[PDB]
Amino acid sequence: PAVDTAEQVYISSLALLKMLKHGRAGVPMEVMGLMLGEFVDDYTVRVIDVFAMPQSGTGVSVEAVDPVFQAKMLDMLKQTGRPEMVVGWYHSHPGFGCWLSGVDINTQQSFEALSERAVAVVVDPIQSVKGKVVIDAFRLINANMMVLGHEPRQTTSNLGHLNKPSIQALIHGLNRHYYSITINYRKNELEQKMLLNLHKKSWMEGLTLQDYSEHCKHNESVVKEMLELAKNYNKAVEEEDKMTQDPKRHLEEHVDVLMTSNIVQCLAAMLDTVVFK
Amino acid sequence: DIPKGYMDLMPFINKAGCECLNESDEHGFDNCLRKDTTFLESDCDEQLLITVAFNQPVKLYSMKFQGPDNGQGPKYVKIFINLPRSMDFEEAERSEPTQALELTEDDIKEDGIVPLRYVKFQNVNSVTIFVQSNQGEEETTRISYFTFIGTPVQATNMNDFKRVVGKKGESH
Amino acid sequence: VLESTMVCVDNSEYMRNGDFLPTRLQAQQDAVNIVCHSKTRSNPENNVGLITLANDCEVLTTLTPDTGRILSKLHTVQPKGKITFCTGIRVAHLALKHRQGKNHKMRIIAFVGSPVEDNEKDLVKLAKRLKKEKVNVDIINFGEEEVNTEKLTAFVNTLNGKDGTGSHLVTVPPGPSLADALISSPILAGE
Amino acid sequence: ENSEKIKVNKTLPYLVSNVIELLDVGKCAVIKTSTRQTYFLPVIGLVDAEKLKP
Amino acid sequence: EFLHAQEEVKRIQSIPLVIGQFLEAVDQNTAIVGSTTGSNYYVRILSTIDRELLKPNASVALHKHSNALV
Amino acid sequence: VGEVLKQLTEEKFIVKATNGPRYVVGCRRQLDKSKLKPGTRVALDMTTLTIMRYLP
Amino acid sequence: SLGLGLAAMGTARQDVYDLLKTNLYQDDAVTGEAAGLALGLVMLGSKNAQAIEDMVGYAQETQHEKILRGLAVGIALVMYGRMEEADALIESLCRDKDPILRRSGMYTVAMAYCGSGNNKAIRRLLHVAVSDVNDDVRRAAVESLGFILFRTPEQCPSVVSLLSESYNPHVRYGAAMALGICCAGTGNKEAINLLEPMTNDPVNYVRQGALIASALIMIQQTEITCPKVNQFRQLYSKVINDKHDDVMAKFGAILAQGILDAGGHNVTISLQ
Amino acid sequence: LNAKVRLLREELQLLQEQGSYVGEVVRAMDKKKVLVKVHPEGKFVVDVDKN
Amino acid sequence: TRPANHRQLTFEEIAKSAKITVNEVELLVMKALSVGLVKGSIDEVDKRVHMTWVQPRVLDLQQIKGMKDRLEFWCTDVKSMEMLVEHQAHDILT
Amino acid sequence: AVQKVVVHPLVLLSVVDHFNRIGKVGNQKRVVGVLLGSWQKKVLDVSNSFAVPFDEDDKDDSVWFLDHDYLENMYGMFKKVNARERIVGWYHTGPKLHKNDIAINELMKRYCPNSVLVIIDVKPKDLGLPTEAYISVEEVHDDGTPTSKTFEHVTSEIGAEEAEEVGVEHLLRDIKDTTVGTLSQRITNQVHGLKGLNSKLLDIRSYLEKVATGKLPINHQIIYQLQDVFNLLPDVSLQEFVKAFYLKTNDQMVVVYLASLIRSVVALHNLINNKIANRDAEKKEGQ
Amino acid sequence: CTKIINADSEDPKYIINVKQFAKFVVDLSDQVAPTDIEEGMRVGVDRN
Ligand SMILES: [Zn+2]
């Protein structure tokens, strides 16, 4: 048997948010938790929920699982509507990359022995600057796999080569002791709307005018800067036409900003004059 | 009967969770699980609500839920799965089933096997079966046999978590 | 027997009566103590809950096996308001429905020391529902016998149907503390 | 069980540090870690504030 | 999508930066800096950080990771 | 533990931690402003390096 | 099931359809991919309402992406050669929320309006190829465009030249493959001119698509009839023989050699 | 538009790559190996690349 | 009662209302403003009172119906401008 | 009391997930849970939640079994996980209140005297926030109307820590809206503002019509606020406002006109550059 | 080791100075004779 290079760990929206929150809720200590999910068949690992684990001093190791805690919370989740498995464990690496180091391989070996499909997800919450989420999923390579003359994981689809690995992980052996399974976040149509509500602008913000004093100051400043750019532009056009750009591009961006601001505020003003009387 | 690869889900049923609401004390739940002609009777009305629980999630291919052939047999079988709480004969009459079988005498007979929509039963821990109507119309309903045919889903049985490698002191 | 019981306590202001020494409050206290310890003395895994039928029902202890906490949270029950038998018994039914081990037979031991200002038709309808839902009600009828023992008798007879020995109705005439009868009663004699 | 939790979270690679300065906002600390550093602390922690003298 | 990319750049000009002394202009788009940590790194300065005022021996903030002068 | 140095745009401050390194850091909203002037001991956030609350 | 779908291709044999349906009415990705393709092939060009209902229902009701992919191709094949009798299904699929089913819709557009140059279908595909969120569906849109335009090969370079210089690598790969399918076995000089720069594209799968599309275009050609055939043979050899070049690009080069020398230099890929 | 979008994209991708230390070569011992001291830490040998 | 369009109250109007000759309407409006009931200003060169506010009070069903009618008219205006803008900007709404 | 309740995207997603994972296995309508968060002045910050088993009879409307033992154990576990978060109320995913709500709030007031019920509406509406927050108040009414224990509104908002913005941004990057004012987007924003104003005015009118015809009692607070709104309506026919409006409209349009002239000159310059490039290409090709 | 912390009878809880770096309080692991430390005996130590 082999693990295809199309396997994906579909991390749900709730799981991703919980992971990032727990990472920056305990940086620069490391944090750990379980990933309740579902092994669909052989190419899918669905991480439906994640599962914080109390900080226990011994970093993140096998002794940091606290069997009483996990058992009791799994029972309680079962009776509240989560009859889910334990597909792997996530554990943050606060700022020093997304890979594994020794104890991680030992712990993931424990999880695999429990069930040989459990992934291990690593999140770097400091490097997760807004606009880039650094999460990577991993699983081990059998000692009799790369030494017996077999590639770590077969390849039947062109899917597994659309993401390039990072040198940070290469150094620690992204391809000598463990894989890298793709993520492929799974978003419903309701979660996306509920999240859009985060920055959704109110009708008030749509229909509210801009402080006229500040608007006039902005008009004046932009028109002056545009005058300077226009003098430079005259000089540039004369010089280029004589001897045979930055002024033109800056002038274009500034004209854009002035026109958008003025038209928007003027139309808002008329709309209000009609709507509120 | 049993296509290769699928096995009867008797061994994975734990009595810790099995129950059957509205059952006559004369004929108990143990009757439906012997393959003998020992039956289960309805107590008050022409309705019944069985519930079976499995140790590890299982996949259900077919059901052998059959009764006698004297007009006292299940007619409308509503199957729900994975119920957080034991339900009542009032929710059983409106809740949308995961399956809505309407048995016929052919299925009722000893050689009748009713196949379910396999896809909706890919992870089953608890099954509640509501018999809403009898084959004809009898104040008491009777069930002669009931067993599921399917496959078990590989279990990640926590509490088995142990050090398979290394010392007992590494932290990170 | 593997059975889960939901001790319903009437904390109505009618519990102030001292016709059961020292007061009906402590009579009920002792009764609950004895019944809970007897259920424990049965196969221990069996579970006991606690409900109070105040102006509107309330749930003190969801099914737990250690009777210490049931007794501790019983000690602070105080007399307030009146009783709502139908609402209390249905809330107890919900508590049973949310029971971890579904084997445990459903029993509700209700102390009904107050006039049950409910209608006989509603009581029989609720009895029919419980009979279909496999609930066994043991009523400790102590207090306004003539006012409500008729309705309680109809309720328990409906529950029993024709041979339904599960549900019982023990009427305790005024006398000593409300335990001596219970220690030898059909509900507890088998236990 | 809370004592057991505190014991489990009191592993024993502690860093030796000073208590250079103290403040009240409750009690706080401005400890100076031997690894030459100065770390502020809102909740003084497991120390019972036995006057925690500088 | 161009607007989104421009915003991503404006974001790379982040707030939590670490200060250090820009030393020299190695080539086009790239330069050598010495952080206030005391160590020197070689990085690529973001587009249009006023390479007029990025004179040698300059005070400059750096992206905590990649130490890029921004 | 560090000291502001220059008070960049009112959402930013150059703070020199004890061990020496200097960072442009944020300003916690409830912290208020105008209380952090060059030399104000502050309790920088350990990771986001934000001025959490001042000190004597 | 793949073999039976191939064998009964076209024939609507109810017995084969029932066997394939029984196989698909389980849940293994491997069985499902083949079962879906086989159902589509067996019901090819029959617009069987029962088959479409069953396939779309199972597609919405399963949880295996692979079965979904197979069902996508199958549904597309079902509306084969039915120009406007597919509009309902095409709209349903293109509005659906599962990206594999939106891809099913685009393949349905292709296999319905196969070789009819229908501007309605082309507008649908070209709109999606820029207004979709899943690159897997953008690529399918461009490839379907390719299928639509093959009775007028001269035109495909026009539609695909603007796509080929796109920042989306999936759209680039779809452009390459659309050129291949359109100008298959035609050696279109404009097509080869558009593909030649793409062979030095910094993304491996676009390189692969360029190589395979070039093979399809130049299949069974000599130097006189096309001037760049030797150039591309040497390019395939170099891509294979390089050590830095990517594995998938090597895969594309190998398949390109195979296609170019297909059938002992005695076979051509002519959709008509 | 495509040109400018692609330029910005590549700029971001290449600028998200970690920097590199600057040291001084004590002596180039052997081909492809250099003994270089990197401030302020000690001196290491390297694995000089191919470019 | 008066809407904002012509909420300018004239001294003669006040005098014809609560019966006081117009040389202490100034004091009446003075006390009204002082107590905090009505905000605004007095412009007595032209003999007018600009009331910009009123102490909201508890109304009757008839008054609430009046407010409902005014809301209806206001809604009609808003919907009209809404339709106009959406119809004239149909090509630039993302 | 508490004025503001800022809920978090994690709370919202958790509620959605609870509703889905129970509705899939049954049909319960409501799903009920506890909210965990922290105070800062009078500004509640709800930053987590968790389901608590619930079951009620939709007929009787006073029989329900919120499970306080489960609540306590679950809160113990989350207290171990993170301690700067104490129970700050509850939530239920029902579009409207229910009779039980006051009793459930009385139950939860045991664990938080200041309880905030956030009715998180799973169904995605297109005009309003999905959270509406309430707090229980019993007080002798000033108007002398008989007093009963009923809810009072507390302002609600959605805000996020940076650790959650990094997630929401990534999840929504596919269907995101540019965080900059493109003129089309701004005109769209104004159209949406008019949509919302119309919706709110329709709501007010419907309520006033119901009040007038009598199907509802009069709420003095609502009437106060409405007559204050009318109080605040502005005047536009006033002359020294029409003058000012014309003045600033003209100033804005001078800026616009200068912008347009600059754009025209730049466009002509680019046209000339291109014509010259083509002329050179043609001449070179000819020679 | 600079101060054996009085050994607290059981659980000695040794201390150590890594000099320029730091001063740690430490335990004994795998050491057969947990007395052969002599309070200054230049003991062994692990990284983390
Ligand atoms: Zn690790």
Swiss-Prot record, chain F:
Residue numbers carrying N6-acetyllysine: K16
UniProt name for this protein: 26S proteasome regulatory subunit 10B
Subunit structure and binding partners: Component of the 19S proteasome regulatory particle complex. The 26S proteasome consists of a 20S core particle (CP) and two 19S regulatory subunits (RP). The regulatory particle is made of a lid composed of 9 subunits, a base containing 6 ATPases including PSMC6 and few additional components. Interacts with PAAF1.
Protein localization: Cytoplasm; Nucleus
Described function: Component of the 26S proteasome, a multiprotein complex involved in the ATP-dependent degradation of ubiquitinated proteins. This complex plays a key role in the maintenance of protein homeostasis by removing misfolded or damaged proteins, which could impair cellular functions, and by removing proteins whose functions are no longer required. Therefore, the proteasome participates in numerous cellular processes, including cell cycle progression, apoptosis, or DNA damage repair.
Similarity field: Belongs to the AAA ATPase family.
Highest taxon listed in the record's lineage: Eukaryota
UniProtKB/Swiss-Prot annotation, chain G:
Domain of life: Eukaryota
Keyword field: Acetylation, Phosphoprotein, Proteasome, Repeat
Record-stated family: Belongs to the proteasome subunit S1 family.
One term under GO cellular component: proteasome regulatory particle, base subcomplex
GO molecular function: enzyme regulator activity; ubiquitin protein ligase binding
Known partners and oligomeric status: Component of the 19S proteasome regulatory particle complex. The 26S proteasome consists of a 20S core particle (CP) and two 19S regulatory subunits (RP). The regulatory particle is made of a lid composed of 9 subunits, a base containing 6 ATPases and few additional components including PSMD1. Interacts with ADRM1. Interacts with ZFAND1.
Entry keyword annotation includes Repeat: yes
Residues of the full protein shown: 478 to 749 of 953
Modified residues annotated as N6-acetyllysine in this record: K243
Cystine crosslinks: none
Keyword field contains Nucleotide-binding: no
PC repeat positions: 1-33, 34-68, 70-103, 104-139, 140-172, 174-208, 209-249, 252-272
Protein name per Swiss-Prot or TrEMBL: 26S proteasome non-ATPase regulatory subunit 1
Role noted for this protein: Component of the 26S proteasome, a multiprotein complex involved in the ATP-dependent degradation of ubiquitinated proteins. This complex plays a key role in the maintenance of protein homeostasis by removing misfolded or damaged proteins, which could impair cellular functions, and by removing proteins whose functions are no longer required. Therefore, the proteasome participates in numerous cellular processes, including cell cycle progression, apoptosis, or DNA damage repair.
From Swiss-Prot, chain I:
Modified residues (N6-acetyllysine): K16
Assembly mode: Component of the 19S proteasome regulatory particle complex. The 26S proteasome consists of a 20S core particle (CP) and two 19S regulatory subunits (RP). The regulatory particle is made of a lid composed of 9 subunits including PSMD13, a base containing 6 ATPases and few additional components.
Family of the protein in this entry: Belongs to the proteasome subunit S11 family.
Role played: Component of the 26S proteasome, a multiprotein complex involved in the ATP-dependent degradation of ubiquitinated proteins. This complex plays a key role in the maintenance of protein homeostasis by removing misfolded or damaged proteins, which could impair cellular functions, and by removing proteins whose functions are no longer required. Therefore, the proteasome participates in numerous cellular processes, including cell cycle progression, apoptosis, or DNA damage repair.
Protein's UniProt name: 26S proteasome non-ATPase regulatory subunit 13
Native species: Homo sapiens
UniProtKB/Swiss-Prot annotation, chain K:
Positions bearing N6-acetyllysine: K19
Triggers of expression: Expression is not cell cycle-dependent and occurs throughout the cell cycle.
Cell compartments where the protein resides: Cytoplasm
Domain of life: Eukaryota
Post-translation changes: Monoubiquitinated by RNF181. Phosphorylated. Dephosphorylated by UBLCP1 which impairs PSMC2 ATPase activity and disrupts 26S proteasome assembly.
Family note: Belongs to the AAA ATPase family.
Entry function: Component of the 26S proteasome, a multiprotein complex involved in the ATP-dependent degradation of ubiquitinated proteins. This complex plays a key role in the maintenance of protein homeostasis by removing misfolded or damaged proteins, which could impair cellular functions, and by removing proteins whose functions are no longer required. Therefore, the proteasome participates in numerous cellular processes, including cell cycle progression, apoptosis, or DNA damage repair.
Assembly and oligomerization: Component of the 19S proteasome regulatory particle complex. The 26S proteasome consists of a 20S core particle (CP) and two 19S regulatory subunits (RP). The regulatory particle is made of a lid composed of 9 subunits, a base containing 6 ATPases including PSMC2 and few additional components. Interacts with NDC80/HEC; this interaction is detected only during M phase. Interacts and SQSTM1. Interacts with PAAF1. Directly interacts with TRIM5.
Full protein name: 26S proteasome regulatory subunit 7
Gene expressing this chain: PSMC2
